[PDB]
Amino acid sequence: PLCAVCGQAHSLEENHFYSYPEEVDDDLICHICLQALLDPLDTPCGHTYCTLCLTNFLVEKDFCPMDRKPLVLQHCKKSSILVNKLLNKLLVTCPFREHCTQVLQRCDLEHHFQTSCKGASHYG
Using the minimum distance from each CB to a second copy, give the nearer residue, 26 or 60. 26
Q: Which stretch binds Zn ion (CB under 5 A): 19-27, 55-63, 87-95, 103-111?
A: 87-95
Q: Checking phi first, is residue 93 left (phi over 0); if not, alpha (psi -120 to 50) or beta?
A: beta
* Cβ-contact 67, 47 below 8 angstroms: yes
Using the minimum distance from each CB to a second copy, give the nearer residue, 3 or 83. 83
Q: Which of 46, 60, 101, 124 binds a second copy (CB under 8 A)?
A: 46
Read out DSSP for 84-97? HHHHHT-EEE-S-T
28 binds, among Zn ion, a second copy, none (CB under 5 to 8 A by kind): a second copy
Write the single-letter amino acid at 92. Answer: V
When asked if residue 85 is in the footprint of a second copy (CB under 8 A), the reply is yes
- Which residues is 94 bridged to in the sheet? none
Q: Which of 24, 28, 66, 91 binds Zn ion (CB under 5 A)?
A: 66
Q: Which of 22, 59, 82, 98 binds a second copy (CB under 8 A)?
A: 82
- Which residues is 9 bridged to in the sheet? 2
